[PDB]
């Protein structure tokens, strides 16, 4: 009854009954909660040298290019330096995305929900197009780079051309374009995936389709959906199921009463607490602590 009117309007924004915007896009990205999966950001949590080893697409080596690509594509990469400049620029963008992710995720975990399961789609493209990945591949890495850029142009949460809408489109598919660069880069498609050209065109069409299906539908009763999505695990939760700690145990009272203290804003909670993080040497000394 607090949120029985919070819905998605036809400009993809989330407004209540009195047209006050609650969120500018639903769930801060515009994506409905059915068509998303747990995925792994590969750019987050290697070292620097493992990142450069796994993502850079070192072009100067002859024999690696001979094994991964066909010889016309090998001499196309080795002859032209404009293509070498564009491959260096996409590795520049992946270092930038790595720094952006490490600001976003200070805890080193990468299990993040995103709509298109890109590794499963690459593996579906492999099984449909009969790859035999022992053989050298036949997709040009500049086709990979340009297809990924055109695809990131085609995935639209926010319409318009004025730079406020451009920044909204950038922020709505920031994390998904980071994952899309990280999974569909030149080096992994040359070395560990080895798709073909028609497989890659099918892949871009599939990613664009399955992203456009995951957009939140205008008209969706988001408020009642979220209130039920929170109140249905409320019955399964229990204050007394957890065993307990015989040592101090700080009376955490998680379960139904803590959910109550969050739902009605209680000025007298049953157990208020802090989490006082120590600054310097006192964090690593029991005596200063």
């Amino acid at each position: 009854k607090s949120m029985e009117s919070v819905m998605v309007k036809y400009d993809a924004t989330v407004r209540n009954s009195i047209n006050q915007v609650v969120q500018l896009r639903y769930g801060e990205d515009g994506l409905a909660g059915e068509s998303v999966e747990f995925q792994n950001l590969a750019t987050l949590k290697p070292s620097n040298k493992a990142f450069e080893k796994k993502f850079r697409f070192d072009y100067t080596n002859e024999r690696a290019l001979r094994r991964t690509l066909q010889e016309d594509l090998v001499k196309d990469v080795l002859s032209n330096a404009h293509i070498q400049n564009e491959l260096e620029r996409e590795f520049e963008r992946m270092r930038e995305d790595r720094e952006v992710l490490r600001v976003i995720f200070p805890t080193g975990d990468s299990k993040v929900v995103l709509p298109c399961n890109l590794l499963r789609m690459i593996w579906n493209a492999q099984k449909i197009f009969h790859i035999n990945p022992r053989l050298p591949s036949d997709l040009h890495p500049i086709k990979v780079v340009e297809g990924v850029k055109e695809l990131s142009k085609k995935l639209v949460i926010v319409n318009g051309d004025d730079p406020l809408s451009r920044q909204a489109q950038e922020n709505a598919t920031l994390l998904f374009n980071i994952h899309l660069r990280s999974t569909l880069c030149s080096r992994r498609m040359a070395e560990e995936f080895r798709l073909s050209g028609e497989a890659f065109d099918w892949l871009l069409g599939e990613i664009e389709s399955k992203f456009n299906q995951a957009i939140a539908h205008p008209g969706e009763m988001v408020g009642a959906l979220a209130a039920q999505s929170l109140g249905e695990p409320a019955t399964q939760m229990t204050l007394n199921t957890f065993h307990y700690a015989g040592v101090s145990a700080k009376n955490v009272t998680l379960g139904v009463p803590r959910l109550k203290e969050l739902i009605n804003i209680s000025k007298k909670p049953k157990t208020p607490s802090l989490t006082v993080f120590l600054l310097g040497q006192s964090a690593r000394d029991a005596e200063r602590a």
Binding site: R284, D285, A286
Partner: protein, 538 residues
Amino acid sequence: XXXXXXXXXXXXXXXXXXXXXXXXXXXXXXXXXXXXXXXXXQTVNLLAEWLIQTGVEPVQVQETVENHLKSLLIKHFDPRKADSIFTEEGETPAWLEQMIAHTTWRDLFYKLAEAHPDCLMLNFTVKLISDAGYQGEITSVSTACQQLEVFSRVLRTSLATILDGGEENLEKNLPEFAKMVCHGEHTYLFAQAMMSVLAQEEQGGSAVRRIAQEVQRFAQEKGHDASQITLALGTAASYPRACQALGAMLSKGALNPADITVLFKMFTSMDPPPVELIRVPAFLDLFMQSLFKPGARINQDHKHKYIHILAYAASVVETWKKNKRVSINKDELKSTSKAVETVHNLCCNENASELVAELSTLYQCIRFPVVAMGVLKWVDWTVSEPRYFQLQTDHTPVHLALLDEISTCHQLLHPQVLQLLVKLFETEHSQLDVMEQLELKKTLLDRMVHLLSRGYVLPVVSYIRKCLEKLDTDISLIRYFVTEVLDVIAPPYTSDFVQLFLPILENDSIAGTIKTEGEHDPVTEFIAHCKSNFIMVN
């Protein structure tokens, strides 16, 4: 008659032979005659040192960077298609001069790259590293040791390095020595044969035997069945069937009771084997595994045979007067047998109030070295069980008091004792209270102080410095260690202890050491003595 040169005069050799006998269409000849389209940059690269004279660093690092770029070019443009051909063709003025001047890492990286071709270049560079005075010092490669004249001398200099090192260098140099001599098992055979011939002498051959035993232990770790090589080097093969039994049993790595009855029928007679067949340490380690694990029950019938075999291993003496014995004795292996029997009974009964009760008898037992080594392995296998620390008496110091007894009555076990204590100290104990974990660490540091008291100090203080500097533990634990060490020690002070104990005290928590001592002064006394020892502090 060309007169078309900018800086191709330095390439005046192959130009000249293409100049006099040009003929036909010399378009390519003229184009290569003027393919040096830049200026005199071979001299202007020498002017880069003159510009570095105005720079920040007019030093030998500029020529070092130029030679490093030349080495990177010679490895990048390495002629791998005609490597053995260019090796086998000239080889007389080029490789000799390069190994005269630039033998630092060039041919070493070249023999690290492929190492199958270029046998003329590999042979010339190997012979030139043989011409190098100190060795084999350039060829430090685990796969370029496949030449006998190389590998023998590299083995020689590494043995000289370890044998001049000592027990401290026994931990640092031995994997860097053992990755060579366990790479090929034929190299292992060569090395162990040299160990045998050097350990024929009683005038310092014990360290050679020790190095052989650690190489054999590393071979057992990495995956050799090197016990058959070890028995084939030994004199034990002179008495065949006992050595064959040991061969099968150390190839299985486990104790068979029937196999020890086969051994025991040959022992305790009027013709024993020479006692160096049973003194092999992997065999005694398998004894400790099969006998003093807290589980692993032994079926009460050939048990006394086991105890008699260990007693005969760790008890008897002999007099090899020109490869024959004339006076052995067996008069202390009854006490050894009684001690190891009492200890195996105490490890079999598994009843901890009884462990506290018969602790005086257990203190009587650990006067013996094989008993103390066995109790050390049993307390290792007992205390390092996860979720052990749930019996709590003074945060369970009972087994740690047995650690103090083992450290007290002996000295050679101290590396294993320290290894056990720093294995428990690094081990994070889940499901314990954090204050309780901290007091467990205080108890382990009390044990490390007790090791420091009985002479074995420098690896302990080295570990405390290592865990203050690298990958840091709690600072309060190091403060407690400093507090307990400085409440017991007094001058005079050996310079190594001062040199090792100074930076942990003066850097990173000066203030916490003194709170309420008063009657005997704190760290201030050690600082004053440290100023009085050294030369200011330096």
